[PDB]
């Protein structure tokens, strides 16, 4: 989304998380800095 | 002619001060019964024949509203509850989706909408297996998830994780005495008609306060002390509507509260060594829990309170209303704890009477609850386990808590609504005659003696 360092510094991320009830997971999303996420596999789609 | 300074150690002088006090309970409370929140052998035994020394020709200024030893008592009670609930089972697994339906017994076919039969999946001892368990929940402790009315959740699941009160531990209030350390003293105002503030002509001193039962209740002070001469109305500032009025009755009004249903308990293993005690079916015919108050006695008491109120409010019409039925259940109903179960009784029939200047028993319908968020703190909830068999208590109404409504444009009439927050008022009604002073034994005064060279 940058106009065009600070372009690649951030990543969209969608994941599942527990709700207030520990039997239902809700699909949420957030913005994470690339310094806080490490790729899982080599395909560049799943992070942690 | 020529005087010299003289130092006296042990001078009977004092000064106002704030300190920390320790607890002392009766020796009978140490007979086994380690299952106790308040005095589980953590209080020193009470001193037999407590020594009260009457101080003569002394006048001291008291203030029940700016008094210490009430905030400290509240903090001590909160810490005691937290400590006693530390080893108890945390109901974290219980925050799960419940499939609730209105349970239909034989008597239901014949207040059965007050409970629902909720079945939910509970994790067994093995983390990879679940068991479809069932329980009975009061409708006050569950809220719907959707608008379809099939799936519910515990009311606390958006706030915190409730802690099942340990079934062995007994939170029955017992008399607690507050004692100062060495170098401090308690001044007791023996003036019988003392209104809670101002100078006190008759003052004495003690080391420990009288037995104060830490009973938590709303709209009605239970199992408290009583005035000696007349009903005493106490307020920090009567003309201020935001200050609750504490009424002290010299005659106790007996109230008998019962839960006549025969409930059954069941155990649900929610983890390794963790059991959650739930509600099974109800045995026999169902009858709503209620409290009984003698009509004549309560009418006389309310008439006396009205007389005192019109004395303090000369040119106005004093009328008693009931608290609005839209707020929290803790403040709109007379809530208390009877025999381990929490009651919430509707006192609309008590303060329904109006007075003009010119064998029957009142029955108050009550509702039981299991998930209790006391201290008005969001995030501190517990689950009171069900108790098998009927439950009966016989408390003494020794005081009321009123609140004058805001002065409207239509003046010449004042409405008093029972209730008022700040649960510290329950303790304040008992610690009105006590204050804490620090002894300053070192004194210097001139005398005709000079130390030898």
């Amino acid at each position: 989304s940058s106009s065009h360092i600070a372009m690649q510094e951030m990543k969209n991320c969608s994941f599942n998380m527990t709700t207030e009830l520990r039997d239902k997971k809700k699909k949420v999303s957030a913005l994470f800095y690339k310094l806080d996420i490490v790729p899982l596999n080599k395909n560049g789609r799943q992070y942690r | 002619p020529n005087l010299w300074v003289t130092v006296y150690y042990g001078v009977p002088v004092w000064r106002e001060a704030k300190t920390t006090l320790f607890c002392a309970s009766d020796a009978k409370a140490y007979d086994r019964e380690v299952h106790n929140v308040w005095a589980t052998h953590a209080c020193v035994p009470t001193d037999p024949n407590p020594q009260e020394i009457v101080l003569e020709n002394v006048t001291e200024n008291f203030n029940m509203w700016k008094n210490d030893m009430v905030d400290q008592m509240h903090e001590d009670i909160i810490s005691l509850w937290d400590q006693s609930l530390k080893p108890c089972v945390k109901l974290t697994p219980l925050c799960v989706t419940l499939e609730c339906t209105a349970f239909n017994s034989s008597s239901h076919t014949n207040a059965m909408q007050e409970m629902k039969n909720c079945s939910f999946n509970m994790t067994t001892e093995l983390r990879d297996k679940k068991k479809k368990v069932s329980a009975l929940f009061y409708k006050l402790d569950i809220v719907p998830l959707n608008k379809n009315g099939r799936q519910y959740r515990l009311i606390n699941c958006n706030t915190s994780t409730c802690t099942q009160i340990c079934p062995k531990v007994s939170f029955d209030p017992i008399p607690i005495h507050y004692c100062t350390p060495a170098g401090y003293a308690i001044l007791k105002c023996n003036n019988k008609t003392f209104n809670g503030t101002g100078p006190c002509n008759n003052v004495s001193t003690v080391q420990c306060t009288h037995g104060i039962k830490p009973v938590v209740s709303t709209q009605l002070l239970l199992n408290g002390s009583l005035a000696e001469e007349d009903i005493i109305i106490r307020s920090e500032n009567l003309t201020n509507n935001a200050k609750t009025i504490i009424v002290h009755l010299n005659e106790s009004v007996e109230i008998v509260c019962i839960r006549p249903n025969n409930m059954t308990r069941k155990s649900i293993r929610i983890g390794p060594g963790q059991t959650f005690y739930a509600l099974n079916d109800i045995i026999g015919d169902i009858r709503q829990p209620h409290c009984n108050i003698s009509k004549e006695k309560w009418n006389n008491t309310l008439h006396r309170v009205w007389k005192k109120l019109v004395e303090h409010f000369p040119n106005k019409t004093i009328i008693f209303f009931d608290r609005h039925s839209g707020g929290d259940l803790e403040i709109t109903t007379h809530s208390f704890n009877c025999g381990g179960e929490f009651f919430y009784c509707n006192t609309s029939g008590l303060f329904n009477i109006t007075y003009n200047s010119n064998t029957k028993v009142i029955t108050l319908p009550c509702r039981i609850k299991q998930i209790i968020n006391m201290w008005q703190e969001v995030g501190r909830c517990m689950y009171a386990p069900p108790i098998a068999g009927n439950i009966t208590c016989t408390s003494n109404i020794t005081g009321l808590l009123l609140t004058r409504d805001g002065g409207n444009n239509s003046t010449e009439t004042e409405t008093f609504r029972p209730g008022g927050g700040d649960m510290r008022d329950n303790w304040r009604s008992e610690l009105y005659k006590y204050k804490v002073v620090e002894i300053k034994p070192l004194g210097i005064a001139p005398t005709g003696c000079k130390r030898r060279v």
Binding site: - | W4, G10, V13, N57, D76, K450
Partner: protein, 126 residues
């Protein structure tokens, strides 16, 4: 008479029962009750130790009634002995002389130190 029994009594009557106050000055489980008991006991010990230290610094150590060599300034209170001693109480005197307590304490410390130096020198001469 009990503890603080002479609170409303005059000076002469109250001074006859300083002992009960002095003895009650030091009268006498993880959780909250035990911790509070320990904290209060420490604080009471501290108060007792400060009082004892002051009495020792003034040369009145181990004494309930101690005459000192500090002259009584008339500016502190011009009232003669008999009126204050058979008319007033200890609370009233404390509130009157509350302004000048620090000065009298400092004077007592200096007087005791000077007496100590003088006694040491007198013994040294012998």
């Amino acid at each position: 008479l009990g503890f603080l029994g002479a609170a409303g009594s005059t000076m002469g009557a109250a001074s006859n029962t300083l002992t009960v106050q002095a003895r009650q000055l030091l009268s006498g489980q993880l959780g909250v009750w035990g911790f509070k008991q320990l904290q209060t006991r420490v604080l009471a010990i501290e108060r007792y130790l400060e009082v004892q230290q002051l009495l020792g610094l003034w040369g009145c150590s181990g004494k309930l009634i101690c005459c000192t060599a500090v002259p009584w300034n008339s500016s502190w209170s011009n009232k003669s002995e008999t009126e204050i001693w058979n008319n007033m109480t200890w609370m009233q005197w404390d509130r009157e002389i509350s302004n000048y307590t620090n000065t009298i304490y400092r004077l007592l410390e200096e007087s005791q130190f000077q007496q100590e130096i003088n006694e040491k020198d007198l013994l040294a001469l012998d």
